[PDB]
Amino acid sequence: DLRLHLLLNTSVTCNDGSPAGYYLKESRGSRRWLLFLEGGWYCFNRENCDSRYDTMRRLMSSRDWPRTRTGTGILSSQPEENPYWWNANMVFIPYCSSDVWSGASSKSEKNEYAFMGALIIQEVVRELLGRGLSGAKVLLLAGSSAGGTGVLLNVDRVAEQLEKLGYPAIQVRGLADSGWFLDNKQYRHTDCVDTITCAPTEAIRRGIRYWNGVVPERCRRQFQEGEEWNCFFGYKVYPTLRSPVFVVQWLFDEAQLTVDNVHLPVQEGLRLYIQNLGRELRHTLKDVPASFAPACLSHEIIIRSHWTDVQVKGTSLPRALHCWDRSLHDSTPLKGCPVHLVDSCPWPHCNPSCPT
Ligand SMILES: *[C@@H]1O[C@H](CO)[C@@H](O)[C@H](O)[C@H]1NC(C)=O
């Protein structure tokens, strides 16, 4: 089990002003640290955040969090479930800021909610340094869905934070799972309003100002004021990052299909739409050297217990991540240990290993 620690700096809060926190299982003698950012969509105005507060309150408040959580998938300490990093120090950071980990705003007489995702990550890192992270050799910032996008938005800031704090030997890396979205046209137009079926460009443009959202500096400098929403789209932000980032993305991600207003005999227009989506996402990954992109209709991968099962070209994700670790040793591709694994077949579940 991972044990809850509420942040000692209680000014760094969940949406409702309760303290944010993290769940930790230490592994003495390991100098690897895995910090995982939970996902769960976002909210971008008072009305939709109020609805989320009624029926998704654990994503906005720590008041009802349990004292422990079981680490699963890449957070498991059992080698059978986690061939990759079972002996690492494990950290699960609950998502309670509803801001894709981008916010830096407190609750105030002018803000019903605090959006502090970017500061939560910073404060978790700061407090972990006193609990053994100061001795780390690798800090892998991982996350799923909005947490995967949160990795892209925050990995270089964590790297900069550690350098400025005097820890230049900690190698900061990112693992972004199911957080690589396309700002494409919907299959059928929806009128936003709700969160899941809203086109993501407009939801994020609204959220940035509502949240006081921050993006990585190089990407901000490219897109400039009013256009920072672009940095929430992996294919646009990734080339600006300096930290190594491994991208895991289903080619037919269910959340991508949801925001595209696709709901699954498929007729020609939808067939072409789906095939074109897979081709576009494959294209965006062509120059991403560390990636795992199976041709499946599914959503998230890394913290589920059976994450070991899917393979691309005969290689599982735990194996690909291990090959990535080897590629980042003091050092040319590795014999039989690939790191770029993108399916080329054009329809969901054309890979027989896709989740059932
Ligand atoms: C608490 O966090 C806030 C926001 O990051 C920061 O401005 C402040 O310095 C922190 N205070 C302490 C005592 O860590």
Short mmCIF file of all heavy atoms in Angstrom, two decimals, residues 48 74 94 117 161 177-178 336:
data_model
loop_
_atom_site.label_atom_id
_atom_site.label_comp_id
_atom_site.label_asym_id
_atom_site.label_seq_id
_atom_site.Cartn_x
_atom_site.Cartn_y
_atom_site.Cartn_z
N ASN A 48 -19.89 24.04 -14.58
CA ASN A 48 -19.46 22.66 -14.74
C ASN A 48 -18.57 22.22 -13.59
O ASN A 48 -18.57 21.03 -13.23
CB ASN A 48 -18.81 22.38 -16.11
CG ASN A 48 -17.67 23.31 -16.44
OD1 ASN A 48 -16.88 23.68 -15.57
ND2 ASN A 48 -17.58 23.71 -17.70
N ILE A 74 2.06 0.02 -13.15
CA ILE A 74 3.39 0.58 -12.99
C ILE A 74 3.65 1.06 -11.56
O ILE A 74 4.82 1.25 -11.19
CB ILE A 74 3.62 1.71 -14.04
CG1 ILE A 74 5.12 1.97 -14.23
CG2 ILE A 74 2.89 3.00 -13.62
CD1 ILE A 74 5.41 2.96 -15.40
N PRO A 94 -2.88 12.44 -6.26
CA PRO A 94 -4.28 12.57 -6.69
C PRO A 94 -4.52 13.87 -7.43
O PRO A 94 -3.97 14.92 -7.09
CB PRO A 94 -5.07 12.55 -5.38
CG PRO A 94 -4.15 11.87 -4.41
CD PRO A 94 -2.75 12.26 -4.81
N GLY A 117 -2.84 22.91 -9.82
CA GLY A 117 -2.17 21.69 -10.26
C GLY A 117 -0.67 21.84 -10.44
O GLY A 117 0.09 20.95 -10.05
N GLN A 161 13.11 23.02 -11.47
CA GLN A 161 12.97 23.16 -10.02
C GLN A 161 14.13 22.47 -9.31
O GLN A 161 14.77 23.03 -8.40
CB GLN A 161 11.64 22.55 -9.60
CG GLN A 161 11.43 22.51 -8.09
CD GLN A 161 10.17 21.75 -7.66
OE1 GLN A 161 9.55 21.03 -8.46
NE2 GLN A 161 9.81 21.89 -6.43
N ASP A 177 0.89 8.96 -20.57
CA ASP A 177 -0.01 7.88 -21.01
C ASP A 177 -1.37 8.48 -21.34
O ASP A 177 -2.02 9.09 -20.46
CB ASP A 177 -0.14 6.87 -19.87
CG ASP A 177 -1.28 5.88 -20.06
OD1 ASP A 177 -1.60 5.57 -21.23
OD2 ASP A 177 -1.82 5.38 -19.05
N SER A 178 -1.86 8.27 -22.56
CA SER A 178 -3.24 8.64 -22.92
C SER A 178 -3.46 10.14 -22.75
O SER A 178 -4.60 10.57 -22.43
CB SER A 178 -4.25 7.82 -22.13
OG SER A 178 -4.00 6.41 -22.34
N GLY A 336 17.22 -6.07 -30.35
CA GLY A 336 16.03 -6.69 -29.80
C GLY A 336 15.42 -5.98 -28.62
O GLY A 336 14.64 -6.60 -27.88
#
